[PDB]
Amino acid sequence: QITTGSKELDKLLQGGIETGSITEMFGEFRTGKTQICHTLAVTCQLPIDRGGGEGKAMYIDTEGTFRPERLLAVAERYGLSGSDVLDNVAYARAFNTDHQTQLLYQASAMMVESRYALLIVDSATALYRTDYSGRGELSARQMHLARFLRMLLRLADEFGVAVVITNQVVGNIIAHASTTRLYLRKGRGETRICKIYDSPCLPEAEAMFAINADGVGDAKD
Amino acid sequence: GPQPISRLEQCGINANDVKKLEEAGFHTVEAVAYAPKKELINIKGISEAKADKILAEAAKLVQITTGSKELDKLLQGGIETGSITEMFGEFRTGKTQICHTLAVTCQLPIDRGGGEGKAMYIDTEGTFRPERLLAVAERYGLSGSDVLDNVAYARAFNTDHQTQLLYQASAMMVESRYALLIVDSATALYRTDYSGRGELSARQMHLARFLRMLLRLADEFGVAVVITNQVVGNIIAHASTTRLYLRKGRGETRICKIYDSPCLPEAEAMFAINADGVGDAKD
Amino acid sequence: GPQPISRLEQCGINANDVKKLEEAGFHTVEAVAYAPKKELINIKGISEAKADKILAEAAKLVQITTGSKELDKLLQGGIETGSITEMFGEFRTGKTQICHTLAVTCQLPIDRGGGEGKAMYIDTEGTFRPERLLAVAERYGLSGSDVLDNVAYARAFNTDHQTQLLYQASAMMVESRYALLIVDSATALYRTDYSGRGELSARQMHLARFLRMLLRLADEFGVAVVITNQVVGNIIAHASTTRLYLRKGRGETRICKIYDSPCLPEAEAMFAINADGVGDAKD
């Protein structure tokens, strides 16, 4: 299983995210989903005993919030090389949903040629909400996302990746196909509150985490 | 530097289609490998099967002073080389003079508030002025005649060549150490070129390509990128590594505010505009 | 520098299509090389393949005194050469006389608040006479007869004919230095032709292309553009680089406000209208 980079959130996940599974997180604006995912992007490279996956991360960014220096800091926290971490976190920003789905093809085709532990899709719904913002064409956006989600599940079996996706609330289409969902709340400080929203296999319990200097970790409060 | 698209011929694509890619301005294999199949398919005779081959075979290969100490102190030293910055506000709040000051000063040593290199001035609005460039050059001690060319120039008058100039830079911006790129009134062409309210999806998808190439160039050559936005959106707030609002007082008195950033707090600084470019709020 | 469309014909486009570009407002390669296909396709008789050929072939190629020192001091020197500036105002504000003043004074030495060149005077309204210019010229010390030659006059009754007079400007403005470009009651031919409520989108498109023509010409030749407008559209309030509001002060004395300008101060100045043109008020 692959570590979220919090011992608490992993013990809530009964050891971390599964190789061969989809999981999601959502919450309020500026709750650090990218910093959880930047941690995951390094930690999936680790030995499996560390909650590792001994393989690369895909970083399907939607929003341009990816930076090398956060990955350098997370790398040296785990004792990994920062430049190995940059070489192990494949980056390109999907500017639209078609580009997000094409980046599942870039991911999968080149993942025949290399071992990935993880796929990140960061603010995934923002592209669906900016290419198809209006109520006029919802079945096209939704079936383009149903394709994208089948492809996530297909990749998770085809290459063994854990798949993590990140979402915005002030949709319900993912609630059955996902194997666990997380809710993030707005606790005080750079410390934040995490809870399992639902899981068919895990407790509805809580974990406390923080944005540290070295990405997301367990709360050091 | 990048893998130039000429090499893709050794990877397998016929040289005629590689020249049709270079005529699309797609002068690097990297500068297509990070983009969707549509942008290749849209090139005449380069079909779906040729875009499949192009991208499969591509994997064989793939701080500047504003002239104001106070505005540079809002910028925590001035514009960082290897970034996008955006400033937005009403007409004449400063855009053209901000750009003319930065386009010169990027040629300075980094310690003197530079980026150690050339500028590109993608002028959407025809407000390039040699007089104004020379006034900054003689103030900051740069060669005035060389400033007129080290500020490499073209007027843009649709978003397409505003953007295809970034693909021309996928050649030209290899050829020296550009410190800077300016697109001046960058958003205005998305408002002139797609103005009927049945046409807005074309503004969106074309703006995505533009902002993609800006941040690419910032990663590919280490340029700072400055984009100036007219007022009388959130995708540009994403692409801009920090955002800025421009305002005014009586006289030529100006204020800037940081309004969006994952890295910097919301903060404000006071400045002015002078016969010798952008400067501090002196009296 | 500027990019004239007189280069396009020799590439393979027939001269009468280049004349349709000029008479539609695309006076320049700086209006057809970097432009959307739809804008070329909208012109009478020009096909999509001819728009393609126009683009492919063009891609082979590529302050004045108002006469009142107080209103000029509000303008921090006067009307800017190489800009659009709009004045809009109430009934009997004498707007033609402001225009006849500017038409004379643009010919003067720049240090006198001149412009060192001719004016175009596109008319909509028949308020011009040669006599108006004669009595103005003799204040500023210009010859009244040469002032008529320096104020190229024609009236339009419709906005196509008016656009054709901007074609006459675009061709003839190469033969002498123009400092100014007047269109007197510029909005009024849109109001005569497009009074039908539903036609506002076609007025806005025709007027937007016309405002661009004025801007290209200002960028091509360094002309100030002066356009006079009527109080009971808002496209001119941001297509002009600063807006001026005229009200009915007492007698021929009229109040000006800088109604919006994030650079020039948004204050007021008082001026009189005379046979000698616009001057400062005396009590």
Short mmCIF file of N, CA and C in Angstrom, two decimals, chain B residues 1-62:
data_model
loop_
_atom_site.label_atom_id
_atom_site.label_comp_id
_atom_site.label_asym_id
_atom_site.label_seq_id
_atom_site.Cartn_x
_atom_site.Cartn_y
_atom_site.Cartn_z
N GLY B 1 19.32 23.33 -24.02
CA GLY B 1 18.14 23.75 -24.79
C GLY B 1 17.24 22.59 -25.16
N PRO B 2 16.14 22.85 -25.90
CA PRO B 2 15.17 21.84 -26.32
C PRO B 2 15.69 20.97 -27.48
N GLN B 3 15.09 19.80 -27.70
CA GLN B 3 15.26 18.99 -28.92
C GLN B 3 14.54 19.67 -30.10
N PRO B 4 15.23 20.23 -31.11
CA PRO B 4 14.57 20.90 -32.23
C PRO B 4 13.81 19.90 -33.11
N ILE B 5 12.70 20.31 -33.72
CA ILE B 5 11.80 19.37 -34.41
C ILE B 5 12.43 18.73 -35.66
N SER B 6 13.50 19.32 -36.19
CA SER B 6 14.35 18.72 -37.23
C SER B 6 14.78 17.29 -36.89
N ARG B 7 15.08 17.02 -35.62
CA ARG B 7 15.54 15.67 -35.21
C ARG B 7 14.44 14.62 -35.40
N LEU B 8 13.17 15.02 -35.29
CA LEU B 8 12.07 14.07 -35.45
C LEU B 8 12.15 13.33 -36.80
N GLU B 9 12.81 13.89 -37.81
CA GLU B 9 13.05 13.20 -39.09
C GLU B 9 13.92 11.94 -38.91
N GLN B 10 14.98 12.01 -38.09
CA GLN B 10 15.79 10.84 -37.73
C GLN B 10 15.00 9.83 -36.89
N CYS B 11 13.99 10.31 -36.17
CA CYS B 11 13.11 9.45 -35.38
C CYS B 11 12.03 8.78 -36.24
N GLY B 12 11.64 9.40 -37.37
CA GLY B 12 11.03 8.72 -38.51
C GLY B 12 10.16 9.58 -39.45
N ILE B 13 9.68 10.76 -39.03
CA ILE B 13 8.71 11.55 -39.83
C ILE B 13 9.35 12.11 -41.11
N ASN B 14 8.62 12.08 -42.22
CA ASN B 14 9.11 12.58 -43.51
C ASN B 14 9.44 14.08 -43.44
N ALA B 15 10.57 14.48 -44.03
CA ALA B 15 11.12 15.84 -43.89
C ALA B 15 10.15 16.94 -44.34
N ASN B 16 9.32 16.66 -45.35
CA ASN B 16 8.27 17.56 -45.81
C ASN B 16 7.27 17.93 -44.70
N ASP B 17 6.79 16.95 -43.94
CA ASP B 17 5.91 17.16 -42.79
C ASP B 17 6.66 17.82 -41.62
N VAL B 18 7.93 17.49 -41.41
CA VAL B 18 8.76 18.23 -40.44
C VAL B 18 8.90 19.70 -40.83
N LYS B 19 9.05 20.02 -42.12
CA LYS B 19 9.01 21.41 -42.59
C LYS B 19 7.63 22.04 -42.47
N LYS B 20 6.54 21.30 -42.69
CA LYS B 20 5.19 21.78 -42.39
C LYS B 20 4.97 22.02 -40.88
N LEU B 21 5.62 21.27 -39.99
CA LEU B 21 5.67 21.55 -38.56
C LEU B 21 6.46 22.83 -38.26
N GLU B 22 7.64 22.99 -38.85
CA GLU B 22 8.41 24.24 -38.76
C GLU B 22 7.66 25.45 -39.36
N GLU B 23 6.83 25.28 -40.40
CA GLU B 23 5.92 26.32 -40.93
C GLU B 23 4.71 26.59 -40.00
N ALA B 24 4.27 25.61 -39.21
CA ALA B 24 3.39 25.84 -38.06
C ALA B 24 4.13 26.50 -36.88
N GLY B 25 5.45 26.69 -36.99
CA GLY B 25 6.32 27.27 -35.97
C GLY B 25 6.71 26.29 -34.86
N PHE B 26 6.32 25.02 -34.97
CA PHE B 26 6.52 23.97 -33.97
C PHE B 26 7.99 23.50 -33.93
N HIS B 27 8.95 24.42 -33.80
CA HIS B 27 10.39 24.19 -34.01
C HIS B 27 11.09 23.28 -32.99
N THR B 28 10.38 22.69 -32.02
CA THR B 28 10.93 21.70 -31.08
C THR B 28 10.01 20.50 -30.89
N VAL B 29 10.62 19.31 -30.78
CA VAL B 29 9.94 18.05 -30.45
C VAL B 29 9.33 18.13 -29.05
N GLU B 30 10.03 18.75 -28.11
CA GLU B 30 9.50 18.99 -26.78
C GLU B 30 8.26 19.89 -26.85
N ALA B 31 8.29 20.94 -27.67
CA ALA B 31 7.20 21.89 -27.85
C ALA B 31 5.97 21.32 -28.59
N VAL B 32 6.01 20.05 -29.02
CA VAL B 32 4.82 19.28 -29.43
C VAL B 32 4.52 18.12 -28.47
N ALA B 33 5.53 17.49 -27.87
CA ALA B 33 5.36 16.35 -26.97
C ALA B 33 4.49 16.68 -25.74
N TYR B 34 4.52 17.92 -25.26
CA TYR B 34 3.65 18.42 -24.18
C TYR B 34 2.37 19.11 -24.68
N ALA B 35 1.79 18.67 -25.80
CA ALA B 35 0.53 19.20 -26.34
C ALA B 35 -0.37 18.12 -27.00
N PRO B 36 -1.70 18.32 -27.04
CA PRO B 36 -2.66 17.33 -27.55
C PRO B 36 -2.53 17.02 -29.05
N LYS B 37 -3.01 15.84 -29.48
CA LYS B 37 -2.94 15.36 -30.88
C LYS B 37 -3.57 16.32 -31.90
N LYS B 38 -4.61 17.06 -31.49
CA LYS B 38 -5.33 18.03 -32.33
C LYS B 38 -4.40 19.07 -32.94
N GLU B 39 -3.44 19.60 -32.19
CA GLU B 39 -2.56 20.68 -32.67
C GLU B 39 -1.67 20.23 -33.84
N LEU B 40 -1.36 18.93 -33.92
CA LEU B 40 -0.66 18.32 -35.06
C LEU B 40 -1.64 17.97 -36.18
N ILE B 41 -2.76 17.32 -35.85
CA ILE B 41 -3.81 16.89 -36.80
C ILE B 41 -4.35 18.07 -37.62
N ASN B 42 -4.44 19.24 -37.01
CA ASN B 42 -4.89 20.46 -37.66
C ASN B 42 -3.94 20.92 -38.79
N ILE B 43 -2.66 20.52 -38.78
CA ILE B 43 -1.74 20.82 -39.87
C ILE B 43 -2.11 19.99 -41.11
N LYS B 44 -2.29 20.69 -42.24
CA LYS B 44 -2.60 20.14 -43.56
C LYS B 44 -1.73 18.92 -43.93
N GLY B 45 -2.38 17.81 -44.25
CA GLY B 45 -1.77 16.54 -44.65
C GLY B 45 -1.15 15.72 -43.51
N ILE B 46 -0.88 16.33 -42.34
CA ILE B 46 -0.39 15.63 -41.15
C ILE B 46 -1.60 15.03 -40.43
N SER B 47 -1.99 13.83 -40.86
CA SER B 47 -3.17 13.13 -40.37
C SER B 47 -3.05 12.62 -38.93
N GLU B 48 -4.13 11.99 -38.46
CA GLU B 48 -4.19 11.21 -37.22
C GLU B 48 -3.06 10.19 -37.11
N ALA B 49 -2.80 9.41 -38.17
CA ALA B 49 -1.72 8.43 -38.19
C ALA B 49 -0.34 9.11 -38.11
N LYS B 50 -0.18 10.29 -38.72
CA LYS B 50 1.06 11.06 -38.62
C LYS B 50 1.22 11.70 -37.24
N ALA B 51 0.17 12.18 -36.60
CA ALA B 51 0.22 12.64 -35.22
C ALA B 51 0.55 11.49 -34.24
N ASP B 52 -0.01 10.29 -34.44
CA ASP B 52 0.39 9.08 -33.71
C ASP B 52 1.89 8.82 -33.82
N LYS B 53 2.43 8.82 -35.05
CA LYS B 53 3.86 8.63 -35.29
C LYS B 53 4.68 9.77 -34.67
N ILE B 54 4.30 11.04 -34.88
CA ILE B 54 5.00 12.21 -34.34
C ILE B 54 5.19 12.08 -32.83
N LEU B 55 4.13 11.79 -32.08
CA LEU B 55 4.22 11.75 -30.62
C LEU B 55 4.89 10.47 -30.10
N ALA B 56 4.67 9.32 -30.74
CA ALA B 56 5.40 8.10 -30.40
C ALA B 56 6.91 8.27 -30.64
N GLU B 57 7.30 8.85 -31.77
CA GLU B 57 8.68 9.09 -32.16
C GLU B 57 9.29 10.28 -31.41
N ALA B 58 8.49 11.24 -30.94
CA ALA B 58 8.97 12.31 -30.08
C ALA B 58 9.54 11.78 -28.76
N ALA B 59 8.97 10.71 -28.21
CA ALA B 59 9.48 10.05 -27.01
C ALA B 59 10.87 9.40 -27.21
N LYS B 60 11.36 9.27 -28.46
CA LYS B 60 12.76 8.88 -28.73
C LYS B 60 13.76 9.99 -28.32
N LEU B 61 13.29 11.23 -28.19
CA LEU B 61 14.08 12.44 -27.93
C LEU B 61 13.69 13.18 -26.64
N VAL B 62 12.40 13.18 -26.30
CA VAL B 62 11.84 13.89 -25.14
C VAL B 62 11.60 12.92 -23.98
#
